[PDB]
Amino acid sequence: GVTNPLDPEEFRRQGHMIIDFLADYYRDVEKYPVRSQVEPGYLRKRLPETAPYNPESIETILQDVTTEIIPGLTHWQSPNYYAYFPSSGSVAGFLGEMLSTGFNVVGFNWMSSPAATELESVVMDWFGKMLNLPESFLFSGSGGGVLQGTSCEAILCTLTAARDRKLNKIGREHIGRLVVYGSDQTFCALQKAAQVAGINPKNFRAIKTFKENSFGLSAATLREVILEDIEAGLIPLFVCPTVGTTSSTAVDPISPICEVAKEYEMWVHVDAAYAGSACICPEFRHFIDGVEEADSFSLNAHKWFFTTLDCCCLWVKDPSALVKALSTNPEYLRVVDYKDWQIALSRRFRSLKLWMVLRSYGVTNLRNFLRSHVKMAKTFEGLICMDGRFEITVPRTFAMVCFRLLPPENLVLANKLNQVYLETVNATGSVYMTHAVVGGVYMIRFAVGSTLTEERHVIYAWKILQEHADLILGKFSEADFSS
């Protein structure tokens, strides 16, 4: 008669069906154009206007996924995807999320699924020790780690925790004087968190950075601005040094910034969404030096640690600060109750993802995985240096190379050249790279990170970059880009 929507046998049948469908995808992903080539509004035309009144077969659905959905995909998993930052996936991360989705438990509290809580605390100490974080950030010591969806939610949590920590001492009425600090290379995650958290929009600070420091935030520039804010009657609150900025993978010196922050009793959050995972390797651990003097530390494991979207790792020194701000139980009362550490009350069993990756691949292989990406970028950097028509614009730090083609006001012309050049490369569908404008210079970002990417794909990307370079420069006229 009526089949249960969760029938075990029908679950097994369609389950194996989609597994093969996805294994075929990973096998054939190279045939698709990396950047989707559909036009805006294509999918509403091809789909009905209302939901069907009668059921449709999974076979019919999967066919529409092939003909209607896949064309509208920009293949983050394609081995020739070098845009933005890596959507790092793996087999282990996938299985952990399907076991999480199969169990389908709600981690509202410890009793709703004790394993959904304790396993998270264990793997966060695993991951933290691999990062060689101090004991002040671990359950082993006096700290604590929590898994969240994205970095912006994590930063929003530490921000409100820092906000409540100060306002509870000086009075809630001073919220309009709290100042959030960052560099002009910081992304929305900080400004967006400040907006949601009630910080006054005129009190967000994007401190200028200079080419002389590879656009890392200078603590000296930070102290000047803070003194300007204190003279204006403002209250310094929150500074977010970034290790591996989005634009050029810039690195803010954490230790000098913490020294400035403690003098003014400021919360320090280290934003390592992308590059943080590389600190598992001892030769990269120096990038988060000074994190021992910060209040929180966050990285997106889905950016460069194979878990698949999404899995943000937040380590804090004082979990009570989060609970004091995010819990809804009365203030006086304010086992681990993770729902008081983040925004989400209906937490997902996210620890299985990170638990599978750490066990399936182990520390030794995980270090070399990250090292292989950096080495492929270091090879791409070596190919650029050998072609006199190109230029490395900033120092490579983590597996991403920023470069630009050079022309044979001059900066304005060069920016237009690289914009047109890059767009013709992306329009082929063979590879995909995004750009950035740092210090007024238009530059191309090559972020090696996709799990399927091998050295042949990076060399293949270099050949296309050269062939289009031969194309635009061979017929170059500065009047074609002087508009």
Ligand X SMILES: N[C@@H](Cc1ccc(O)cc1)C(=O)O
| Residues 80-99 contacting ligand X, CB under 6 A | 84-87
Applying CB under 6 A, among 130, 206, 309, 413 the residue interacting with ligand X is 309
Q: Which ranges in 232-292 belong to alpha helices (H)?
A: 254-263
Q: Which does 21 bind (CB under 5 to 8 A by kind): a second copy, ligand X, none?
A: a second copy
Q: Are strands 400-405 and 441-447 parallel, antiparallel or unpaired?
A: antiparallel
Between vectors from CA 309 to CA 304 and to CA 311, what angle results, nearest 5°? 75
CA pair distance 261, 462, nearest whole angstrom: 43
Identify which of residues 106 and 464 has a Cβ nearer to ligand X in the complex. Answer: 106
Of 297, 201, 287, 284, nearest to 240 by C-alpha is 297
Identify which of residues 113 and 214 has a Cβ nearer to a second copy in the complex. Answer: 113
Pair 471, 464: CB distance under 8 Å: no
Identify which of residues 68 and 387 has a Cβ nearer to a second copy in the complex. Answer: 68
Could you tell me how many residues of this chain bind ligand X (CB under 6 A)?
Answer: 14
Applying CB under 6 A, among 303, 350, 404, 435 the residue interacting with ligand X is 303
Show the tokens assigned to 481.
């880009």
Sheet bearing 400-405, strands edge to edge: 390-392, 400-405, 441-447, 435-438
Smallest separation, CB 351 to a second copy (Å): 10
Sheet bearing 235-239, strands edge to edge: 144-148, 312-316, 296-300, 267-271, 235-239, 178-183, 204-207
Smallest separation, CB 100 to ligand X (Å): 13
Q: Which ranges in 47-150 belong to alpha helices (H)?
A: 58-64, 91-103, 114-130
Given the rule CB under 6 A, which of 5-13, 79-87, 286-294, 460-468 is the region that contacts ligand X?
79-87
> How far are the Cα atoms of 6, 13, 15 from residue 2, in angstroms, in the given order?
12, 17, 20
- Per-residue binder mask for ligand X (CB under 6 A), 1-40, x = binder: ----------------------------------------
- Restricted to residues 226-285, the positions that interact with ligand X (CB under 6 A) are 246
- Restricted to residues 178-217, the positions that interact with ligand X (CB under 6 A) are 187
Q: Which does 246 bind (CB under 5 to 8 A by kind): ligand X, a second copy, none?
A: ligand X
Identify which of residues 78 and 203 has a Cβ nearer to ligand X in the complex. Answer: 78
Question: Does 108 engage in binding with ligand X (CB under 6 A)?
Answer: yes
Identify which of residues 60 and 483 has a Cβ nearer to a second copy in the complex. Answer: 60
Smallest separation, CB 87 to ligand X (Å): 4
- Restricted to residues 336-355, the positions that interact with ligand X (CB under 6 A) are 345-346
Smallest separation, CB 450 to ligand X (Å): 10
Smallest separation, CB 228 to ligand X (Å): 29
Smallest separation, CB 5 to a second copy (Å): 4
Show the tokens assigned to 331.
């203030």
CA pair distance 144, 165, nearest whole angstrom: 18
> How far are the Cα atoms of 153, 297, 320, 447 from residue 251, in angstroms, in the given order?
22, 14, 29, 16
Identify which of residues 41 and 388 has a Cβ nearer to a second copy in the complex. Answer: 41
Q: Which ranges in 107-253 belong to alpha helices (H)?
A: 114-130, 151-170, 188-196, 219-231
The SS3 assignment for 281 reads coil
Smallest separation, CB 434 to a second copy (Å): 9
Identify which of residues 28 and 478 has a Cβ nearer to a second copy in the complex. Answer: 28
Binding site for ligand X (CB under 6 A): 84-87, 106, 108, 187, 246, 300, 302-303, 309, 345-346
